[PDB]
């Protein structure tokens, strides 16, 4: 039994889209400046739910109007995923993230909307409301843009006692901080956000090395890449992006090893075949 | 809405009593139009040339079947406007008359 | 389905016009 | 079996009428079997549901969601003829080929409406040297949606919006405005 | 079936005339059956309220479908020649049906132990759709429509004017 | 002098870009004779004009001034055989200038 | 019954290619700078029409020859399309604009070509012959442009009383034209080209008050998007880009109201099922 | 010297580019008879050329001067034998006149 | 349309009563080309070589089954021009005589 | 498709000029 729920934040509450629902996820991460993606596929809406949630989606009220001065701006959405069986649940959190375009795909007798969101659309911030660091280490501007943007932080990287001059003074809204920290040091060393931990690493590290996961069931068969393995697995709610892996294979008896996540594809469909993760991954050092 | 210039079985634009000229319309000019479109043999019209009845290829002539002259007859009375089809056909051949008789359903 | 990458080669316009 | 003993308002007789001209088409076509597929869709996928609210406030939105919910396609009939004349055929054949051609088919006590013909299929056999066996399909193009409608008169009519693009300058004997006033002038 | 009092007895069923050169094709095949099948579309269109508009209406080709007995090596060779036949359009007269534009699709031959003499054969012709069926055509060598070439990128030789010349004077 | 294509409909409203202007006639049957809205670049110019061969449908000045134009009808206006017998046509300044000129001293 | 005719403009004439021939015509119109765009797959093309067409059609006589002027140097072609019944036509226009790129998608037996004609293609023009205005206001800017591309033009804004110091003294060529009014003011402004008109009107206002069009057909659902309605609809020979719909639906009842036009997706297919536009719409203020 | 590409029907119309022109020649049955129809560069040059072997068809100086070139016709033009027998020939401003100069003394 | 000069039964070019060569055209033309091609041994074209009747592996030979020599004479019938088929090709077998019999339909 | 898109993306990229 799959169970996958869409957990919405509106003024009257959390309505969880259930898993009975015909529900399909597709997300899209990894470990660059760009934000992670989420397209849902939702059918069977009544009536009241479609007016309930698409009519709070829109793009206006910042535009054309004013509205805003914080979040109830767009809608921010969560995605809990996992299994369940003798009672026990397996309930984790694969995103978080502010939806940003609605659509139908299937017309009638089945009205199932087509919603897409990407994690940290509050782009339009409060344009930078704290000064970033005159002259300062790549550590404290990395704190600098975490506490601008609210998130907690992991930085983790042998370049942080590294002084700039003048570090981002050139930044419009909050999202350009990350893209920011990005382009400084881009060899390696590749600032994310995943859900709302604001990761800054080498990537050839993990951000925790004491949560490696033993990889030993795979579907297909992990195989070679350019940098890594690349596999796909079940759905596991212990796998996050960026994180150490421990693939031990059969089919393939080279790959096994110890590697680092780059980037992460779910595919979540609760009545669908599909329901697997496929992670790309890279030797850890 | 057919309107042809009144001809009688001469088949020459013939006058009223008053020397003028009757533009029959609708159902009288789809039947006057009708009878023209049988009598003309095939390769007389210039700028058509396969328009018209086979009158010497399909009939009078030593042939097989006569399903040719049905099919020409019946392409020429639908080369008519406002004829939409026929409704019945007939072919019967006598000793040496080729009867012909057609129910057109024209719209009007 | 380029339609979803199209959609996604879009979110590059913050609030900044800047025009 | 005297089959001229017809029921008076369940008459097993097909009438094949035309709503252009509503007259009998396709007469002497003996009819052998007719078939009337009427099917629709409904929802696939579970509909949702928001309980916990009461009696009969449930029961209206869970109405407007079943309207909501289904699909009806169109009616489709397959009739089985033996036509005994070849005027029949070649009327058949010249329907079918005309692009514009609704009629009203009317079984023994259906009366299908705004039906259009799809396939037909004319078999030449040893076992029937005369007649030809025919198979022909109909869909329904409109269902018979009743047009309310401002009728009987030219006036009291809908404006219909006719958005024209470019206007050609003209032709005949016209010289500009004094060809204008020449043909007007002529009161005619 | 009947239109046609021929009130000849002698007269023949099926007829496969080549449209150019109007003559006889396979005179000597020995048809069993014939199916005239027609084909066209619908366009469905579900809309909002429970209802479908139909669309308008495209006549597919129309098939036809021969069953016949070839009695010699000749007619077989025949109807292998009709279908590799690709520059002449056939016209079939079946049973007072006529149907022009006519080309050869498929043919099956059959070779079994219940007939050794003759060759059973499925021929399947379908109909070549053309914009207007009723072409308008002139009967005198002046006055034809203008064709078109567009562009012709004119090509090379080497003559001289004076080869032009002698040939001019010649 | 333009032709504008007309349709056998009782009532009806045609849009166009001509002269420089964007007009807007609707046509519609009256009791016994036909009546036109017309209207310019949006806002409206008239009401219910009564339609006849030959007078010009902006009869006062300022709404056919300056050089803006006109429509005339070449017959009684009669949607039933409007498209084929009777055709409105759209002069320019000019040319309604020139009609004009040739209307005011019959 | 469906009528679709591409006539096109060579120096024999008007060839117009009807709707018996297959044909399948897909355009694409928007409130925007770019060139609105269709692509045209027509069959059942005889020797002698594929040589009168594809042999005009052509990118040279401009690059590696001089053969060029005014119009002439490529065809253009227009597109009337509409429905048919009880001898009434409803033939509209839906497109204007010049081939671009030729090529062929289905080999024989049925030789089909696929054009792709682009608004406004003949960019190709004399280089900007009258020099813009050195200071002016957005209005006059935008008769200059409307002028310098021989279209008439709708300029119908609020911005229009600002002046501009060089107002596109950086234009290269009369298509640049639309590009720059365009990239001044724009966070509602976009101008744009309709067929032979040049729009330049606030993306919240109708071009036409009074031409509003009621819809209340629609195929499929008329649904939310993340800015307005979107919507599909069979062909109605009254529906323009920036025109005014009055949305009444049944399935969704909170859709309901006036919204002007954004986009539009004509999908045309005489031999085919495919006979639809879709409309997304934004509020109109 | 260019042979301009023919095909065996009584009227027609074949557009080149030759000698840096934009060359369209009309060719068509008029009684006994062809006439030709010739356009470069778009405007018409001449109309209704009778057309004959050798003799150029465009007749007049005004038309192939300076240096655009004539066409020529090795036999009496005849349709019935385009392609097959009987071709035109396209010389530019030095052939043709090298070939006046070689007519003129004939 | 196919043309030939003229020749006799001794294949040779047979002249006429003023000493000049006779060029027939289309249907004399294309039925002695039909003659001349069924005379000509496989092999004998240096620039065909596979072209030819099958006169000593077909024919002139204990062949099980003649429908070898029926296809090589078909070969050599439809080589010629404006051919496009044969009606009836008998292939019967006298005492010690392989007659052959052919009904082109050529285009003429 | 895709490729229409493509086709669309170069002719975007053509102008009068070449510098």
Same mark, same amino acid.
């Given at each position: 039994?799959?169970?996958?729920?869409?957990?919405?934040?509106?003024?009257?509450?959390?309505?969880?889209?259930?898993?009975?629902?015909?529900?399909?996820?597709?997300?899209?991460?990894?470990?660059?400046?760009?934000?992670?993606?989420?397209?849902?596929?939702?059918?069977?809406?009544?009536?009241?739910?479609?007016?309930?949630?698409? $009519?709070?989606?829109?793009?206006?009220?910042?535009?054309?109007?004013?509205?805003?001065?914080?979040?109830?701006?767009?809608?921010?959405?969560?995605?809990?995923?996992?299994?369940?069986?003798?009672?026990?649940?397996?309930?984790?959190?694969?995103?978080?993230?502010?939806?940003?375009?609605?659509?139908?795909?299937?017309?009638?007798?089945?009205?199932?909307?087509?919603?897409?969101?990407?994690?940290?659309?509050?782009?339009?911030?409060?344009?930078?409301?704290?000064?970033?660091?005159?002259?300062?280490?790549?550590?404290?501007?990395?704190?600098?843009?975490?506490?601008? &943007?609210?998130?907690?932080?992991?930085?983790?990287?042998?370049?942080?006692?590294?002084?700039?001059?003048?570090?981002?003074?050139?930044?419009?809204?909050?999202?350009?901080?990350?893209?920011?920290?990005?382009?400084?040091?881009?060899?390696?060393?590749?600032?994310?956000?995943?859900?709302?931990?604001?990761?800054?690493?080498?990537?050839?590290?993990?951000?925790?090395?004491?949560?490696?996961?033993?990889?030993?069931?795979?579907?297909?068969?992990?195989?070679?890449?350019?940098?890594?393995?690349?596999?796909?697995?079940?759905?596991?709610?212990?796998?996050?992006?960026?994180?150490?892996?421990?693939?031990?294979?059969?089919?393939?008896?080279?790959?096994?090893?110890?590697?680092?996540?780059?980037?992460?594809?779910?595919?979540?469909?609760?009545?669908?075949?599909?329901?697997?993760?496929?992670?790309?991954?890279?030797?850890?050092? | 809405?057919?309107?042809?210039?009144?001809? @009688?079985?001469?088949?020459?634009?013939?006058?009223?009593?008053?020397?003028?000229?009757?533009?029959?319309?609708?159902?009288?000019?789809?039947?006057?139009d009708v009878r023209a479109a049988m009598l003309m043999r095939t390769?007389?019209?210039?700028?058509?040339?396969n328009s018209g009845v086979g009158y010497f290829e399909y009939i009078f002539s030593?042939q097989?079947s006569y399903d040719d002259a049905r099919k020409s007859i019946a392409d020429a009375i639908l080369s008519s406007?406002?004829v939409?089809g026929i409704e019945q056909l007939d072919i019967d051949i006598?000793?040496?008359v080729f009867g012909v008789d057609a129910k057109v359903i024209?719209?009007? | 389905?380029?339609?979803?990458?199209?959609?996604?080669?879009?979110?590059?316009?913050?609030?900044?016009?800047?025009? | 079996?005297?089959?001229?003993?017809?029921?008076?308002?369940?008459?097993?007789?097909?009438?094949?009428?035309?709503?252009?001209?509503?007259?009998?088409?396709?007469? $002497?076509?003996?009819?052998?079997?007719?078939?009337?597929? $009427?099917?629709?869709?409904?929802?696939?996928?579970?509909?949702?549901?928001?309980?916990?609210?009461?009696?009969?406030?449930?029961?209206?939105?869970?109405?407007?969601?079943?309207?909501?919910?289904?699909?009806?396609?169109?009616?489709?009939?397959?009739?089985?003829?033996?036509?005994?004349?070849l005027s029949?055929?070649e009327s058949?054949?010249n329907?079918?080929?005309?692009?514009?051609?609704?009629?009203?088919?009317?079984?023994?006590?259906?009366?299908?409406?705004?039906?259009?013909?799809?396939?037909?299929?004319?078999?030449?056999?040893?076992?029937?040297?005369?007649?030809?066996?025919?198979?022909?399909?109909?869909?329904?193009?409109?269902?018979?949606?009743?047009?309310?409608?401002?009728?009987?008169?030219?006036?009291?009519?809908?404006?219909?919006?006719?958005?024209?693009?470019?206007?050609?300058?003209?032709?005949?004997?016209?010289?500009?405005?004094?060809?204008?006033?020449?043909?007007?002038?002529?009161?005619? | 079936?009947?239109g046609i009092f021929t009130?000849?007895?002698?007269?023949?069923?099926?007829?496969?005339?080549?449209?150019?050169?109007? /003559?006889?094709?396979?005179?000597?095949?020995?048809?069993?059956?014939?199916?005239?099948?027609?084909?066209?579309?619908?366009?469905?269109?579900?809309?909002?309220?429970?209802?479908?508009?139909?669309?308008?209406?495209?006549?597919?080709?129309?098939?036809?479908?021969?069953?016949?007995?070839?009695?010699?090596?000749?007619?077989?060779?025949?109807?292998?020649?009709?279908?590799?036949?690709?520059?002449?359009?056939?016209?079939?007269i079946?049973?007072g049906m006529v149907?022009?534009? &006519?080309?050869?699709?498929?043919?099956?031959?059959?070779?079994?132990?219940?007939?050794?003499?003759?060759?059973?054969?499925?021929?399947?012709?379908?109909?070549?759709?053309?914009?207007?069926?009723?072409?308008? &055509?002139?009967?005198?060598?002046?006055?034809? $429509?203008?064709?078109?070439? @567009?562009?012709?990128?004119?090509?090379?030789?080497?003559?001289?004017?004076?080869?032009?010349?002698?040939?001019?004077?010649? | 002098?333009?032709?504008?294509?007309?349709?056998?409909?009782?009532?009806?409203?045609?849009?166009?870009?001509?002269?420089?202007?964007?007009?807007?006639?609707?046509?519609?049957?009256?009791?016994?004779?036909?009546?036109?809205?017309?209207?310019?670049?949006?806002?409206?110019?008239?009401?219910?004009?009564?339609?006849?061969?030959?007078?010009?449908?902006?009869?006062?000045?300022? /709404?056919?001034?300056?050089?803006?134009?006109?429509?005339?009808?070449?017959?009684?206006?009669?949607?039933?055989?409007?498209?084929?017998?009777?055709?409105?046509?759209?002069?320019?300044?000019?040319?309604?200038?020139?009609?004009?000129?040739?209307?005011?001293?019959?």
């Amino acid at each position: 039994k799959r169970i996958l729920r869409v957990t919405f934040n509106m003024p009257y509450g959390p309505e969880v889209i259930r898993e009975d629902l015909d529900v399909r996820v597709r997300i899209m991460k990894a470990a660059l400046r760009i934000q992670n993606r989420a397209t849902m596929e939702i059918f069977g809406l009544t009536t009241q739910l479609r007016e309930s949630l698409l $009519s709070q989606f829109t793009a206006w009220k910042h535009r054309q109007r004013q509205v805003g001065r914080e979040d109830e701006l767009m809608i921010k959405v969560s995605v809990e995923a996992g299994y369940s069986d003798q009672g026990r649940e397996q309930v984790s959190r694969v995103f978080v993230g502010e939806v940003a375009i609605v659509d139908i795909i299937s017309p009638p007798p089945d009205i199932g909307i087509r919603i897409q969101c990407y994690t940290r659309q509050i782009d339009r911030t409060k344009t930078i409301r704290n000064m970033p660091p005159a002259n300062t280490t790549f550590v404290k501007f990395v704190e600098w843009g975490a506490n601008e &943007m609210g998130l907690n932080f992991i930085c983790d990287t042998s370049y942080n006692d590294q002084v700039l001059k003048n570090p981002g003074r050139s930044i419009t809204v909050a999202s350009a901080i990350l893209a920011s920290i990005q382009d400084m040091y881009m060899p390696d060393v590749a600032a994310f956000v995943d859900d709302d931990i604001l990761i800054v690493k080498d990537r050839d590290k993990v951000i925790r090395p004491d949560e490696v996961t033993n990889v030993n069931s795979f579907v297909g068969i992990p195989s070679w890449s350019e940098w890594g393995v690349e596999f796909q697995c079940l759905f596991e709610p212990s796998i996050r992006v960026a994180g150490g892996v421990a693939v031990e294979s059969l089919m393939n008896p080279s790959v096994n090893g110890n590697y680092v996540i780059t980037a992460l594809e779910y595919d979540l469909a609760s009545r669908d075949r599909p329901f697997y993760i496929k992670v790309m991954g890279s030797p850890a050092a | 809405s057919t309107s042809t210039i009144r001809t @009688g079985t001469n088949n020459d634009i013939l006058l009223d009593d008053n020397g003028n000229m009757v533009i029959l319309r609708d159902v009288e000019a789809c039947a006057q139009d009708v009878r023209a479109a049988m009598l003309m043999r095939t390769g007389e019209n210039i700028f058509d040339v396969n328009s018209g009845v086979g009158y010497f290829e399909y009939i009078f002539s030593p042939q097989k079947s006569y399903d040719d002259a049905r099919k020409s007859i019946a392409d020429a009375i639908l080369s008519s406007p406002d004829v939409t089809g026929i409704e019945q056909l007939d072919i019967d051949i006598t000793g040496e008359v080729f009867g012909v008789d057609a129910k057109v359903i024209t719209i009007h | 389905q380029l339609t979803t990458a199209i959609q996604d080669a879009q979110n590059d316009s913050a609030t900044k016009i800047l025009y | 079996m005297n089959s001229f003993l017809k029921s008076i308002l369940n008459t097993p007789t097909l009438t094949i009428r035309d709503d252009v001209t509503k007259l009998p088409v396709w007469k $002497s076509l003996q009819v052998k079997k007719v078939e009337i597929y $009427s099917p629709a869709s409904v929802v696939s996928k579970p509909l949702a549901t928001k309980d916990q609210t009461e009696a009969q406030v449930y029961t209206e939105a869970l109405d407007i969601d079943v309207k909501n919910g289904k699909i009806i396609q169109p009616v489709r009939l397959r009739i089985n003829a033996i036509c005994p004349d070849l005027s029949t055929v070649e009327s058949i054949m010249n329907a079918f080929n005309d692009n514009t051609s609704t009629f009203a088919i009317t079984s023994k006590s259906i009366l299908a409406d705004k039906m259009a013909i799809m396939t037909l299929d004319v078999d030449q056999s040893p076992d029937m040297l005369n007649a030809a066996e025919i198979n022909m399909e109909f869909e329904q193009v409109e269902p018979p949606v009743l047009n309310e409608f401002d009728p009987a008169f030219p006036q009291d009519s809908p404006t219909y919006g006719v958005q024209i693009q470019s206007l050609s300058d003209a032709n005949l004997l016209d010289l500009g405005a004094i060809g204008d006033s020449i043909s007007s002038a002529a009161k005619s | 079936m009947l239109g046609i009092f021929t009130s000849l007895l002698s007269s023949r069923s099926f007829s496969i005339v080549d449209q150019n050169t109007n /003559q006889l094709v396979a005179a000597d095949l020995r048809i069993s059956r014939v199916n005239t099948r027609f084909s066209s579309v619908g366009q469905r269109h579900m809309l909002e309220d429970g209802k479908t508009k139909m669309d308008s209406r495209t006549i597919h080709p129309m098939e036809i479908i021969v069953e016949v007995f070839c009695p010699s090596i000749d007619v077989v060779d025949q109807i292998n020649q009709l279908l590799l036949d690709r520059d002449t359009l056939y016209k079939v007269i079946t049973r007072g049906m006529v149907f022009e534009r &006519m080309m050869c699709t498929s043919e099956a031959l059959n070779q079994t132990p219940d007939m050794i003499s003759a060759t059973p054969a499925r021929l399947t012709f379908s109909q070549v759709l053309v914009q207007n069926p009723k072409p308008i &055509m002139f009967r005198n060598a002046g006055d034809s $429509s203008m064709i078109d070439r @567009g562009l012709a990128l004119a090509e090379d030789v080497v003559g001289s004017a004076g080869d032009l010349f002698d040939y001019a004077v010649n | 002098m333009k032709k504008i294509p007309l349709t056998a409909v009782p009532n009806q409203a045609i849009s166009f870009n001509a002269g420089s202007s964007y007009w807007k006639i609707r046509l519609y049957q009256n009791m016994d004779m036909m009546n036109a809205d017309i209207s310019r670049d949006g806002v409206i110019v008239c009401h219910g004009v009564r339609c006849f061969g030959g007078i010009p449908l902006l009869q006062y000045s300022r /709404q056919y001034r300056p050089d803006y134009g006109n429509f005339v009808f070449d017959r009684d206006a009669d949607w039933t055989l409007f498209g084929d017998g009777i055709n409105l046509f759209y002069l320019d300044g000019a040319e309604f200038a020139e009609y004009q000129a040739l209307a005011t001293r019959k």
